[PDB]
Amino acid sequence: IIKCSRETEKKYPQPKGQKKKKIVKYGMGGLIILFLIAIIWFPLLFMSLIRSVVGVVNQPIDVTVTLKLGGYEPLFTMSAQQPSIVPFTPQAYEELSQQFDPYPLAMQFISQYSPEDIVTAQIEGSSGALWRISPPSRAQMKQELYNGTADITLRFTWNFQRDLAKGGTVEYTNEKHTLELAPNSTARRQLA
Amino acid sequence: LIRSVVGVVNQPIDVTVTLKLGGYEPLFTMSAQQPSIVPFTPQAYEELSQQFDPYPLAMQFISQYSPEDIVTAQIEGSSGALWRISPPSRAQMKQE
Amino acid sequence: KVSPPSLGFLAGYGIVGLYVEIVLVVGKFVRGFFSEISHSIMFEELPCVDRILKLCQDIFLVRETRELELEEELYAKLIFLYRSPETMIKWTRERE
Amino acid sequence: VDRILKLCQDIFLVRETRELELEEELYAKLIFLYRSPETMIKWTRERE
Amino acid sequence: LDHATVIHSGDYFLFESDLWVLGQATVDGLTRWLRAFTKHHRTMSDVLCAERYLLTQELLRVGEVRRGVLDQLASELLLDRRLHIPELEEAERFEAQQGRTLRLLRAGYQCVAAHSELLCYFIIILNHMVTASAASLVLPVLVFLWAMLTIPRPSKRFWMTAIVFTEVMVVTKYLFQFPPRILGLEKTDSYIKYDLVQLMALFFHRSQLLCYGLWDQPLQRFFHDILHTKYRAATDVYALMFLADIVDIIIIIFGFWAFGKHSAATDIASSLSDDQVPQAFLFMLLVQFGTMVIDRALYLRKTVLGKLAFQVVLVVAIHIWMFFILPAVTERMFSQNAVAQLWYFVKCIYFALSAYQIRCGYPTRILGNFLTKKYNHLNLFLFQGFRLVPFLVELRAVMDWVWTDTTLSLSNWMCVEDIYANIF
Ligand SMILES: CCCCCCCCCCCCCCCCC[C@@H](O)O[C@H](CO[C@H](O)CCCCCCCCCCCCCCC)COP(=O)(O)OCC[N+](C)(C)C
Ligand SMILES: CCCCCCCCCCCCCCCCC[C@@H](O)O[C@H](CO[C@H](O)CCCCCCCCCCCCCCC)COP(=O)(O)OCC[N+](C)(C)C
Ligand SMILES: CCCCCCCC/C=C\CCCCCCCC(=O)O[C@H](COC(=O)CCCCCCC/C=C/CCCCCCCC)COP(=O)(O)OCCN
Incomplete structure (x- = not known):
């Protein structure tokens, strides 16, 4: 190697x-x-490019939602798809921005979203399936709602899904919102 | 140290259980939550230890657990949902 | 917004992990490219290496010509040459 | 190492003073210094 | 015969020898530091006042010979070989001995009188920073274009221009006190914000400049010609510019919401960990990094015309960015905004340093590391820490090698740099 370098210099x-x-x-x-x-x-420039115009929209193609009391049976469960998925129009974006104007954090967060990114899920109020439940378990539910000396939860789960063909890593995302019913409260008596 | 006093208890907040025959439909399915989840008391721990006294492995394994770590799931005997099944599939089940 | 399918294998690495996995490795490589260059000066700055190349070629020739004793002596000479830097300077000097 | 430091400082000075030939000679001197350990010992000896 | 053979030509012949007490101590040290910091001006004042006493004592009828009557204690020296006058020496003995805090105030006033040219710029900058307007913008920019770019003085008539301008501005604001906000400072509120202080400081500077003795289109061709001469003060202030740039970077890192469309006091680590990458942070970092790279290029290449052009572009661009589009997009103009004015002040410090460097010129001795000056333990530790951070040593070395004059290749340059670091 040294000789090659020397002769190339020569x-x-x-x-x-x-x-x-x-x-x-x-x-x-x-x-x-x-x-x-x-x-x-x-990394900074590349990711800021992905977050910019080059990013591909990830619009969920199906949203499900369930309301469940304790652990007996899902009281309410329903889905929704593209006939009931309403993408935001520029006008609706204007009303959304005007609603949260007196709050700066909301305006910033909304500003981080393109009009063709925010969608509304129109979930039907009525359940999409009969409330199957065994009569003994229904009686146990009623007894727990009257005389249950302990809290009972009320989970409101929601579960999205997206299309992986356009681009992405995870298909399903979800999260439950959990209440808490104190015994001898008005809510438990009213459900009973 | 993590296995010792500093460890945080991980108490299950929900247990489900199903009995299913073949692949037709779940014959039995039921859940359970904190009204029916009974944490072991020191007394019940004493009976549990006394029951398995003539076995050393059981005593060691139980000794590796703090009283406020072992819980009993009281599953209702009756199913928590109707046994939905198509009559043709029920007839196929009976024939099988 | 999500990354296009082509650049997905980039998006897999989190920006912080994109720094650690790729940026820090490149930095370590470029740092090691010139870390201790002063130490390896004696063997990398020879003015003329024709004599050493001739010595190696004679070693290779005698290896096949079967005069094995000559190979042993030449190898001893080469080892001594690389053992003393002053003889290295003397042999790497440029002649007329 | 005062002499070697002085040599490096002279290299840096001549690099900007434009006497480029002096830079070439100083670099050759430094390379030779780091090429022979005996001259290294001679230069790294401590004077009065 | 050639360059390579000169590289590979070395031989042995080249190497041939031939409580209260602590408070008193601290205030005494502070007074000592001020005295050492204005000693030259103290001596100037002492010799001038001695000469003035000689001139006034002889004033029986008329002083007729300008040299002769003063020559009782050849005409071009800065020393002291004079006689002794009892009232003088008793005056400074009284001033020296019997004083605990009076001497501190005297030293402070002596310092502020000694400078008299820095606090004027400081007051102008502060007044413009507290009242943003197109009326209060021309003065700072023309300070950054005339006052700091006239070499053998602060300026000739720029001072009178400043008095006339503050004159007209205060008169107009008073008359209007009987989009204007961006147009000027005409609002039915507190109008003389800092004009009085600026005028008083300016006239105090005028009085000092007169009493200590001084004055008070082809013209621009001559102006730009004098910025290209020989043998000026020849002092480099670069590490201070780099420190100011680092301070600006830190300010941007910690405060960057104030330049966004709506400040929310959000954290940067949360945003990066949540994969948000705010746009404003990115753009400020890119602009600052480019500015530092260009500045290092200019400093290494050792040119003044390029540096002057870069300064005149940068100052006007920075001034146009604020007071304008930047408070136009977000309604927190200047006073309500908190960190933009601090960032602007740091950038004015940078501009002042750059203009000082341009006026002084570039000293011949450069390329030495700004840590390899004294061989202390702190210097060694901090230099090792500097060399530990990734990408800094290689980038600095390559920038040096590209932009200084040398006959070596990159590998040889790296050999020399490594040798120097190890020897240091
Ligand atoms: C806590 C942290 C540390 C900091 C703490 C605070 C420190 C504050 C320090 C403030 C220092 C201010 C210094 C101001 C200097 C002003 C000098 C000016 O007044 O000079 C006058 C001249 O000013 C000019 O003529 C312009 C006009 C300025 C008019 C200002 C009037 C202000 C009057 C204030 C009166 C206050 C009275 C208070 C009574 C209690 C008179 O000097 P002159 O007779 O040229 O002297 C000639 C001989 N020399 C050159 C050797 C000195
Ligand atoms: C937007 C609508 C309103 C616009 C209003 C514009 C008004 C412009 C007014 C301009 C007035 C300029 C006055 C300048 C006074 C200079 C006084 C002079 O003494 O200064 C000299 C120095 O003069 C300066 O070099 C002049 C600099 C001029 C720079 C002009 C820049 C113009 C930029 C325009 C940009 C416009 C952008 C768009 C705006 C809308 C000092 O020289 P000196 O040291 O004694 O020389 C020594 C040698 N001697 C002894 C023989 C004399
Ligand atoms: C969020 C806060 C984090 C902590 C901040 C701490 C700040 C501390 C403040 C300042 C310390 C300064 C000490 C060093 C001073 C060096 C002065 C100097 O001369 O600088 C040059 C600087 O050299 C360069 O030009 C290197 C940089 C070139 C690229 C531009 C850099 C852009 C800014 C980067 C800042 C760091 C990145 C992260 C910022 C946040 C964290 C600090 C190096 O020395 P030489 O020039 O060889 O000496 C010759 C003098 N005759």
Whole structure:
């Protein structure tokens, strides 16, 4: 390797004391500094590009929701799909922005979303399936609602789904909202 | 240290159980939550220890558990939902 | 918004993980590219290496010409050459 | 290491003073210094 | 015969030898530091006042010979080989001995009188920073274009221009006190915010400049010609500019919501961990990084015309960005905004340092690391910490190699730098 380098230098000798070939100096230096700058700024710039125009919209194609009391049986369960999924129009975006104007955090968060990103799920009020339940378990439910000396929960779960063909990693997301019914309260008596 | 006093108790807040024959339909299915989840008391721990006294492995395994770690799930005997099944599939079940 | 399918294998790495997995590795590589260059000067700055190359070629030739004793002596000479830097300078000097 | 530090400082000074030939000679001297350990010992000896 | 053979030509012949007490101590140290910081002006005042006493004592009828009557204690020296006058020496003995805190105030007033040219700019900048308007913008920019770019003085007539301008501005605001906000400071509120203080400081500077002795289109061609001369003060202030840039970076890192469409005092670590990447933070970091890279390029290349052009572009761009589109997009103009004015003040410090560097010129001695000056333990530790951070050493080395004059390749440059670091 050393001999190859020496003979390659010999084939193209350089005058003594000459400053440098400016063209190759600027070329190599600019390429090296550009590569260093690109490596430094690659994640931030690349992700800010993904968050920008180049990002692909991920519109959920199905939303389900269930209301369940204790652990007996789902009291209410319903789905929704594209006939009942309403994408926000620019006008509705204007009303949404005007509603939250006296709050800066809401305006910032909304501003981080393009009009064709926020959708409304119109869930039918009536259940989409009969409330199957064994009569002994219904009687136990009623007894717990009258004389149960302990709390009973009320989970309101929601579960989205998205299309992975457009692009993504996880298909399903979900989250429950949990209440708490104190014994001898008005709510338990009214449910009973 | 984590296994010792500093460890946080992980008490299950819901247990479900199903009995299913073949692949027709769940014959029995039921859940249970905190009204029917009974944490062990020190007394019940004493009876549990006394029951398995003539076995050393059981005593060691039980000794590896703090009183406020072992819970009893009181599952109702009756099903918590009707046994939905199509009559043709019920006839196929009986024939099988 | 989600990444397009082509760049998904980038989006898999979180921005912080995108720094650690890729940026820090490149930084370590470029740092190690010039970490201790002063130490390896004695063997990397020889003016003329024709004599050492000739010595290696003679070793290779005698390896096949069967004069094995000559191979042993040449290997001893090469080892001594790489053992003393002053003889290295003397041999790497440029002649007329 | 005062002499080696002085040599490096002279290299840096001549780099900006434009006497480029002096930079080439100083760099050759430094390379030779780091090439022979005996001259390294001679230069790293402590004077009066 | 050539460059390579000169590189590989070394031989042995080259190497041939041939409580209350603590408070008193602290205030005494502070007074000592002020005295050491204005000693030259103290000596100037002492010699001038001695000469003035000689000039006034002789005033029986007329002083006729300007040199002769003063020559009782060749005409171009800055020293002291004079006689002794009892009232003078008793005056400074009285001032020195019997004083605990009076001397502190005297030293402070002596310092502020000694400068008299920095607090004027400071008051102008503060007044503009507290009352943003197109009326109060021309003065700071033309301070950054005339006052700090006239070499062998602060300026010639810029001072009188400042008096005339504050004159006309205060008169107009008073008359209007009987979109105007961006147009000027004509609102039915407190109108003379800092005009009185600015006028008083300006006239105090005028009085000092007169008493200590000074004055009070081809013209621009001559102005730009004098910015290219020989052998000025030749002092470099670059590490201070870099420190100011780092302070700006830290301010942006901690405070960046105030430049967004609606400030929410949100954290940056939360946003990055939640994968949000705010746009304003990105754009400020890119702009600042480009500015530092250009500044380092200019400093290494050692050119003043390029640096002057960069300064005149940067100051006008920064001034146009604020007071304008930036408070136009968000209704927190200037006074209500908290960190934008601090960032602007730091940027004015940077502008002042840059203009000082342009006026002084570039000293021949550069390329030395701003840590390799004294060999203390602190210096060693902090230099090791500097070399530990990724991408900084390689980037600095490549920038140096590209933008200084040398006959070496990159590998040889890296060899030299590594040798220097190890030896240090
Ligand atoms: C806690 C943290 C630390 C900081 C704490 C606070 C520190 C505050 C320090 C404030 C320092 C202020 C210094 C101001 C200096 C002003 C000097 C000015 O007044 O000079 C006058 C001249 O000013 C000019 O003529 C312009 C006109 C300015 C008019 C201002 C009038 C202000 C009057 C204030 C009166 C206050 C009375 C208070 C009574 C209790 C008179 O000097 P002159 O006779 O040229 O002297 C000639 C001889 N010399 C040059 C050797 C000195
Ligand atoms: C928007 C609608 C309203 C616009 C209003 C515009 C008004 C413009 C008014 C401009 C007035 C300029 C006055 C300048 C006074 C200079 C006084 C002079 O003494 O200063 C000299 C220095 O003069 C300066 O060099 C002049 C600089 C001029 C720079 C002009 C920049 C114009 C930029 C315009 C940008 C417009 C952008 C768009 C705006 C809407 C000092 O020289 P000196 O040291 O004694 O020379 C020594 C040698 N001697 C002894 C022989 C004299
Ligand atoms: C969120 C807060 C985090 C902590 C902040 C702490 C701040 C501390 C404040 C300042 C300390 C400064 C000490 C160092 C001063 C060095 C002065 C100097 O000369 O600087 C150059 C700086 O050299 C460069 O130009 C290097 C940088 C070039 C690229 C531009 C950098 C952009 C800004 C980056 C800041 C760091 C990134 C993270 C910021 C947040 C965390 C700090 C290096 O020395 P030389 O120039 O060789 O000396 C020659 C003098 N005759």
